[PDB]
Enzyme design. Structure first.
Site, PDB file in Angstrom:
ATOM      1  N   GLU A 282       1.515   1.939   3.926  1.00  8.56           N
ATOM      2  CA  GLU A 282       0.776   2.608   2.874  1.00  8.56           C
ATOM      3  C   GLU A 282       1.321   2.300   1.493  1.00  8.56           C
ATOM      4  O   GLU A 282       0.562   2.034   0.570  1.00  8.56           O
ATOM      5  CB  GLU A 282       0.779   4.122   3.085  1.00  8.56           C
ATOM      6  CG  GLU A 282      -0.023   4.607   4.270  1.00  8.56           C
ATOM      7  CD  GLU A 282      -1.513   4.309   4.159  1.00  8.56           C
ATOM      8  OE1 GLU A 282      -2.013   4.112   3.024  1.00  8.56           O
ATOM      9  OE2 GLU A 282      -2.193   4.271   5.220  1.00  8.56           O
TER      10      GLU A 282
ATOM     11  N   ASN B 165      -9.497   4.166  -5.704  1.00  9.22           N
ATOM     12  CA  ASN B 165     -10.556   3.649  -4.858  1.00  9.22           C
ATOM     13  C   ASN B 165     -11.833   3.795  -5.688  1.00  9.22           C
ATOM     14  O   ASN B 165     -12.417   4.881  -5.798  1.00  9.22           O
ATOM     15  CB  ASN B 165     -10.603   4.448  -3.556  1.00  9.22           C
ATOM     16  CG  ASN B 165      -9.199   4.652  -2.948  1.00  9.22           C
ATOM     17  OD1 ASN B 165      -8.563   3.702  -2.469  1.00  9.22           O
ATOM     18  ND2 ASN B 165      -8.700   5.889  -3.008  1.00  9.22           N
TER      19      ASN B 165
ATOM     20  N   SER C 245     -11.688   8.301  -5.845  1.00  8.22           N
ATOM     21  CA  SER C 245     -10.524   9.048  -5.418  1.00  8.22           C
ATOM     22  C   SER C 245      -9.308   8.161  -5.630  1.00  8.22           C
ATOM     23  O   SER C 245      -9.441   6.951  -5.772  1.00  8.22           O
ATOM     24  CB  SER C 245     -10.638   9.457  -3.944  1.00  8.22           C
ATOM     25  OG  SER C 245     -10.653   8.337  -3.064  1.00  8.22           O
TER      26      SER C 245
ATOM     27  N   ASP D 105      -5.149   7.579  -4.249  1.00  3.80           N
ATOM     28  CA  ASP D 105      -4.164   7.835  -3.194  1.00  3.80           C
ATOM     29  C   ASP D 105      -2.829   7.900  -3.893  1.00  3.80           C
ATOM     30  O   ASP D 105      -2.523   7.029  -4.708  1.00  3.80           O
ATOM     31  CB  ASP D 105      -4.147   6.701  -2.192  1.00  3.80           C
ATOM     32  CG  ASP D 105      -5.434   6.611  -1.407  1.00  3.80           C
ATOM     33  OD1 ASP D 105      -6.047   7.657  -1.154  1.00  3.80           O
ATOM     34  OD2 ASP D 105      -5.841   5.487  -1.045  1.00  3.80           O
TER      35      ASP D 105
ATOM     36  N   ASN E  43      -4.621  11.198  -0.120  1.00  2.00           N
ATOM     37  CA  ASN E  43      -5.862  11.208  -0.869  1.00  2.00           C
ATOM     38  C   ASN E  43      -6.172  12.504  -1.626  1.00  2.00           C
ATOM     39  O   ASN E  43      -6.217  13.592  -1.042  1.00  2.00           O
ATOM     40  CB  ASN E  43      -7.030  10.818   0.041  1.00  2.00           C
ATOM     41  CG  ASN E  43      -8.264  10.411  -0.740  1.00  2.00           C
ATOM     42  OD1 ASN E  43      -9.064  11.248  -1.118  1.00  2.00           O
ATOM     43  ND2 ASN E  43      -8.410   9.118  -1.001  1.00  2.00           N
TER      44      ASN E  43
END
Length: 130
Positions: free
Chosen positions: A35, A46, A51, A53, A60
């Site tokens: 990640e 994103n 959104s 992260d 998220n």
């Protein structure tokens, strides 16, 4: 902060991540690795759904933390997303625990399915003394 592998392994163990909701420490290590590369300040926007992260586990903002800009978002972890960018991962871990308490569990992160699920993940904790 970019953690060294074994340093992170030991930290996660001390925070009670080993076997949490049936998830072994080596799976959490595989997740953090893919990640963010063990980087606590990693953030990823994103564009497709607006959104972002946040942090080591790339949590998220749409469901887990509040950054104020994500549309129709909730803050299930009851944290400011800013808390997931600290060097001290205590809040990120408490929030990751919350995420897996949901029915999907660790599968909530697609990167886990792609690169950790059904693989030999022992390598992530080998030699770390955990």
């Amino acid at each position: 902060k970019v953690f060294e592998r074994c340093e992170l392994a030991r930290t996660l163990k001390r925070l009670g991540m080993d076997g949490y909701r049936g998830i072994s420490l080596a799976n959490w290590m595989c997740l953090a690795k893919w990640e963010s590369g063990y980087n606590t300040r990693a953030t990823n926007y994103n564009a497709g759904d607006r959104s972002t992260d946040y942090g080591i586990f790339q949590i998220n903002a749409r469901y887990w933390c509040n950054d104020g800009k994500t549309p129709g978002a909730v803050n299930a972890c009851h944290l400011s997303c800013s808390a997931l960018l600290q060097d001290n991962i205590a809040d990120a871990v408490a929030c990751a625990k919350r995420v897996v308490r949901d029915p999907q569990g660790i599968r909530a992160w697609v990167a886990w399915r792609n690169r950790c699920q059904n693989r030999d993940v022992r390598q992530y904790v080998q030699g770390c003394g955990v």
